[PDB]
Amino acid sequence: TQSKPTPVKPNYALKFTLAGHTKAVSSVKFSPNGEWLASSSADKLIKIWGAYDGKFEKTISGHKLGISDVAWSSDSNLLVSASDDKTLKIWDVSSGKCLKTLKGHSNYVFCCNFNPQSNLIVSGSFDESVRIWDVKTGKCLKTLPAHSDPVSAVHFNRDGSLIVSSSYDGLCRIWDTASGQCLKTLINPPVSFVKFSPNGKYILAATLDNTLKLWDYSKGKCLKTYTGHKNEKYCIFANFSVTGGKWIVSGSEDNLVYIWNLQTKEIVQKLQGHTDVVISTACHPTENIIASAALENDKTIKLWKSDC
Numbered sequence: 437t438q439s440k441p442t443p444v445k446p447n448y449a450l451k452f453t454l455a456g457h458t459k460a461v462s463s464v465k466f467s468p469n470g471e472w473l474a475s476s477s478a479d480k481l482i483k484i485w486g487a488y489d490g491k492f493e494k495t496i497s498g499h500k501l502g503i504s505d506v507a508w509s510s511d512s513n514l515l516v517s518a519s520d521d522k523t524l525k526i527w528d529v530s531s532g533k534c535l536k537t538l539k540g541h542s543n544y545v546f547c548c549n550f551n552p553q554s555n556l557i558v559s560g561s562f563d564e565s566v567r568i569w570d571v572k573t574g575k576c577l578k579t580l581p582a583h584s585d586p587v588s589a590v591h592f593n594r595d596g597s598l599i600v601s602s603s604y605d606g607l608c609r610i611w612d613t614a615s616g617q618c619l620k621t622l623i624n625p626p627v628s629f630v631k632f633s634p635n636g637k638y639i640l641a642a643t644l645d646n647t648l649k650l651w652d653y654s655k656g657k658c659l660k661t662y663t664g665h666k667n668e669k670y671c672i673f674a675n676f677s678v679t680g681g682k683w684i685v686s687g688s689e690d691n692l693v694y695i696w697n698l699q700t701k702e703i704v705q706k707l708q709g710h711t712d713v714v715i716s717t718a719c720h721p722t723e724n725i726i727a728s729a730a731l732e733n734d735k736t737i738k739l740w741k742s743d744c
């Protein structure tokens with residue numbers, strides 16, 4: 437009577453191409469409430485787009501140099517952005533206004549995230565530090581001497597008690613948010629992306645040898661390896677697709693979006709259409725929708741939808 441769905445490949449297909457950025461796109465993120473897509477770019481702008489119809493909503497401006505990353509608060513009302521101007525900015529998405537500018541990094545800010553409570557922001561920089569910021573006061577709470585090369589990614593776990601960071605130094609580290617102290621170091625190719633898994637027990641890490649790995653960070657054991665894409669140069673995001681079939685999703689330097697079966701590690705789809713490196717992908721929180729974004733020969737975001 438009641439059965440698990442019969443597994444089938446997904447059928448993501450291009451629905452919309454979102455044009456308007458004038459330099460490379462650097463990140464795309466769906467709002468937690470599913471209504472919006474935010475994009476950031478080397479053109480110093482953030483743009484907001486409808487998640488279901490791709491329709492342009494607004495441009496948010498104020499950074500003085502290019503932006504590498506943007507991230508949503510849990511209530512979908514705020515964004516934080518990380519810029520080459522050495523700052524982060526907190527934005528009210530409804531008004532487009534900059535609420536706070538977070539100063540303290542001494543070089544490009546590359547990555548950022550709110551914690552799920554969204555009272556904190558974590559950032560990673562070319563200055564080799566991770567900073568933890570108070571959203572309400574806009575002040576830095578802690579500076580972690582996290583790495584010995586630029587920090588490529590930072591992510592909180594579900595209850596915000598842990599931060600995972602990655603770096604070109606070849607390390608992934610797990611930090612205690614409350615104290616800022618290191619809990620674990622996983623180890624030497626540059627690590628270009630990392631995030632916690634949906635069950636909170638694993639980390640998904642990209643390295644610049646064309647490889648994604650799923651690690652049990654407590655045990656220090658690699659559970660799965662995903663290959664077939666191209667990744668030797670850029671920090672390319674990777675995602676867990678949790679709405680339908682269990683997939684891993686990533687961009688690639690051969691201009692494709694790759695989708696793998698989580699368990700078997702087989703490639704189940706490659707999405708064709710971009711004309712430069714796909715630097716960022718995002719998975720919609722409740723529907724089978726992927727956003728992808730590309731570098732400066734392309735400069736567009738594409739929205740892809742699957743029936744399962």
Ligand SMILES: COc1ccc(Br)cc1S(=O)(=O)Nc1cc(Cl)cc(C(=O)O)c1O
Binds near residue numbers: 650
């Ligand atoms: C509930 O967790 C997940 C849900 C969706 C995705 Br996509 C990934 C995870 S996970 O946190 O990565 N856990 C996980 C890891 C592996 Cl290798 C296999 C399985 C499996 O169900 O066969 C699995 O659940």
